[PDB]
Amino acid sequence: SVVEATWNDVQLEDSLGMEVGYRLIPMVDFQQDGELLGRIRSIRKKFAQDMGFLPPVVHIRDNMDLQPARYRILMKGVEIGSGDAYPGRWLAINPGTAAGTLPGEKTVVPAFGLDAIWIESALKEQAQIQGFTVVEASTVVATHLNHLIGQFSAELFGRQEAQQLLDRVSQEMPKLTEDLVPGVVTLTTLHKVLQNLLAEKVPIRDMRTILETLAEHAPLQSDPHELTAVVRVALGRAITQQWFPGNEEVQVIGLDTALERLLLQALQGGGGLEPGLADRLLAQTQEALSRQEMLGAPPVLLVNHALRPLLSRFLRRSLPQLVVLSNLELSDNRHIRMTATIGGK
């Protein structure tokens, strides 16, 4: 080569990254406009003021093995999503209800999970008025990034990100922090708690309540999978108001009184559930899920407080659409009504 090899030639693995074909470099250009880097900043901003932490910088490099207009989205090196985005063009998408068609390569685009037609620039006002939603091309990439962050936010929330958060908390209630870590709770434990929380879509903007609650219970208990369940109940009014806004009815999914004990039994001296139960749940569970999807009701299962740690650990890795709550985490001022059940069909 021209210049001698130095340690600066060691590229470390990026927490969150992106690779881009040459036809897309113009929208990821530092020097030129950067039509996309604007949209990425707005995602990282609107994520911290919303989910309570700053996602890690998106390291974008180009890679010439890719098609001209293809992007890969990477996490810690592994590709976690990819798609095609064409700069001169726009995208037209039916929300499921519009009528008409249009000229183009019909593609079930990966960013939205809907069917949609890439169209050229001038058909805009017509596509909007036939019933379509018309987006720019950077917006396609950006929207695709945004789903991937809010689906991997548990694994993007690394220990280095937890310390960085602890330092933002520590400048607005320094009392709280000075003696909770590494005093009563080790940063390992705190991180395992906030990660278990981000994992089930539970916002952690209320550090005031999470540290107050830990500092109360940490001396007499230090299993994260146990403190997690107790921070959850501290956040009950906030979790309730997440999936059930207003003070109207609470149309939940529940499980059967016998099935409850069936599992409650398998809990005590069991190291895990047995194979037979397994496949019955997921079918019987997806059964009740499909009813609520027609009725207009949310996908929330409401279980006994000792069953939630493990129905969510078991069901969610198949149907991550599913929210698994606890009767102890709902507000009392709320009217319940189990409008779908998990029993003998």
> Is 271 part of a structural domain of the chain?
yes
In a shared domain, residues 147 and 40: yes
**Taking Cα atoms as reference points, which of 129, 309, 127 lies closest to residue 227?**
309
In a shared domain, residues 133 and 193: no
SS3 content of the chain, % helix, strand, coil (to 5): 45, 15, 35
In a shared domain, residues 167 and 306: yes
> Residue type at 279?
D
Q: Of the candidates 105, 130, 157, which is a domain's last residue?
A: 157
DSSP one-letter string for 137-197:
HHHHHHHHHHHHHHHHHHHHS-HHHHHHHHHHHTTT-HHHHTTTTTTTS-HHHHHHHHHHH
In a shared domain, residues 133 and 187: no
> Is 60 part of a structural domain of the chain?
yes
In a shared domain, residues 237 and 90: no
Residue 345: partners with Cβ closer than 8 Å, 6 or more residues away: 284, 287
In a shared domain, residues 181 and 311: yes
In a shared domain, residues 190 and 332: yes
Q: Is 230 helix (H, G, I), strand (E, B) or coil?
A: helix
Give the range of the structural domain holding residue 59, as residue numbers without chain letter. Answer: 14-157
How was this structure determined? It was done by X-ray
Q: Of the candidates 101, 136, 157, which is a domain's last residue?
A: 157
> Is 3 part of a structural domain of the chain?
no
How far apart CA 65 and CA 82 sit, in angstroms, is 14
- Total domains in the fold of the chain: 2
The 10 Å CB-count burial string (b at 16+, else e) for 166-177 is beebbeeeeebb
Q: Of the candidates 157, 172, 191, which is a domain's last residue?
A: 157
Please say whether the beta carbons of 55 and 16 come within 8 A.
yes
**Taking Cα atoms as reference points, which of 49, 52, 50, 36 lies closest to residue 145?**
36
Alpha-carbon separation of residue 298 from 245, 295, 333 (angstroms): 11, 9, 19
- Report the side by side order of strands in the sheet with 300-303: 323-326, 300-303, 250-255, 336-342
> Is 208 part of a structural domain of the chain?
yes
In a shared domain, residues 276 and 311: yes
In a shared domain, residues 73 and 178: no
Alpha-carbon separation of residue 113 from 45, 82, 117, 285, 319 (angstroms): 24, 13, 13, 23, 17
> Is 270 part of a structural domain of the chain?
yes
> Is 169 part of a structural domain of the chain?
yes
Record the tokens describing residue 56, joined without a space. 């890690």
| 302 bridge partner residues | 254, 325
In a shared domain, residues 319 and 191: yes
How far apart CA 265 and CA 261 sit, in angstroms, is 6
Beta strands, E only, the chain? 16-20, 59-62, 70-75, 78-84, 90-93, 106-107, 116-119, 133-135, 250-255, 300-303, 323-326, 336-342
What angle, rounded to 10 degrees, do the helices at 159-169 and 187-199 form? 100
How far apart CA 46 and CA 62 sit, in angstroms, is 26
Please say whether the beta carbons of 325 and 255 come within 8 A.
no
* CATH code, domain carrying 101: 3.40.30.60
Please say whether the beta carbons of 253 and 343 come within 8 A.
no
How far apart CA 219 and CA 173 sit, in angstroms, is 21
Backbone phi, then psi, for 11, in 5-degree steps?
Answer: -95, 120
- Provide the sign of the torsion angle of the four alpha carbons 306, 311, 222, 233, taken in this order: negative
Please give the distance of CA 248 from its chain centroid, rounded to a whole number: 26
In a shared domain, residues 208 and 321: yes
> Is 149 part of a structural domain of the chain?
yes
- Provide the sign of the torsion angle of the four alpha carbons 42, 45, 50, 53, taken in this order: positive
Backbone phi, then psi, for 291, in 5-degree steps?
Answer: -60, -60
**Taking Cα atoms as reference points, which of 282, 276, 250 lies closest to residue 262?**
276
How far apart CA 170 and CA 309 sit, in angstroms, is 30
Paired sense of beta strands 16-20 and 59-62, if any: parallel
Please say whether the beta carbons of 86 and 194 come within 8 A.
no
H or E element, residue 316: none
